[PDB]
């Protein structure tokens, strides 16, 4: 299983972008995704997970409102829509599977990933 | 904040256990893992366990080798890693897996991440 992020770069306070996970080797379907950052000299933080159907989900405080996560599995795609955004939300982001967790060893679930991340800076002036 | 401990130096072949213990949050209500980034390499999973503690996970490079557990009348996890080796140096963080709301307005906690403790696997 091999994730690829893309859709990072430079931009302005109060601009909008939508990151986007490719997954390859797996059928992203098996997997329950979230994103993951890290800003500069801090430690990481949630930012949002979704179900494998998509019918669940999870936000942050700090980026609930501003922030829509959606897959397409067809695509096998997760994105990340990130609205006005704000010099706070410079950091990298990572797209990662969630762990499927097994009673013994008893299943056959595809390995858990993490991706490489992409680096989003909002920045101005 | 979550916090863990009980790394640092262990000699090659040799076991740690590593604990994570939290102040402002319940760590038995969440379904926990601990992941490890070693230097100069990505961030990866190593291990999960459910809240309360009868479902696992393990990364294929230390399943065999590992063994994760929790104690939740005190609200600690552990992770138990034996026959150490260089790959596995590493800093490594306890966290919180996210609960998922099916729909809007659920009231589950924010998850949180620990600021992570290095492993030094030296002689």
């Known amino acids: 299983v091999q994730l690829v992020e893309s859709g990072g770069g430079l931009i302005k306070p109060g601009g909008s972008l939508r990151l986007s996970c490719?997954?390859?080797?797996?059928?992203?379907?098996?997997?329950?995704?979230?994103?993951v950052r890290q800003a500069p000299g801090k430690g990481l933080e949630w930012?949002?997970?979704?179900?494998?159907?998509?019918?669940?989900?999870?936000?942050?405080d700090s980026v609930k409102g501003r922030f829509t996560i959606s897959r397409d599995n067809s695509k096998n795609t997760v994105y990340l829509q990130m609205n006005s955004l704000r010099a706070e939300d410079t950091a990298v982001?990572?797209?990662?599977?969630?762990?499927?967790?097994?009673?013994?060893?008893?299943?056959?679930?595809?390995?858990?990933?993490?991706?490489?991340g992409t680096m989003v800076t909002v920045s101005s002036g | 904040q979550l916090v863990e401990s009980g790394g640092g130096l262990i000699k090659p072949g040799g076991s740690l256990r590593l604990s994570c213990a939290a102040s402002?949050?319940?760590?038995?209500?969440?379904?926990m893992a601990w992941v490890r980034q070693a230097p100069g390499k990505g961030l990866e999973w190593v291990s999960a366990?459910?809240?309360?503690?009868?479902?696992?996970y393990y990364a294929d490079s230390v399943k065999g080798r590992f063994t994760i557990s929790r104690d939740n009348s005190k609200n600690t996890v552990y992770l138990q890693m034996n026959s150490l080796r260089a790959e596995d140096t590493a800093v490594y963080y306890c966290?919180?897996?996210?609960?998922?709301?099916?729909?809007?307005?659920?009231?589950?906690?924010?998850?949180?991440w620990g600021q992570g403790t290095m492993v030094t696997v030296s002689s």
């Open positions: 402002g949050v319940r760590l038995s209500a969440y379904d």
């Open positions: 366990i459910s809240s309360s503690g009868g479902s696992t």
């Open positions: 966290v919180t897996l996210p609960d998922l709301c099916p729909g809007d307005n659920c009231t589950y906690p924010d998850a949180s």
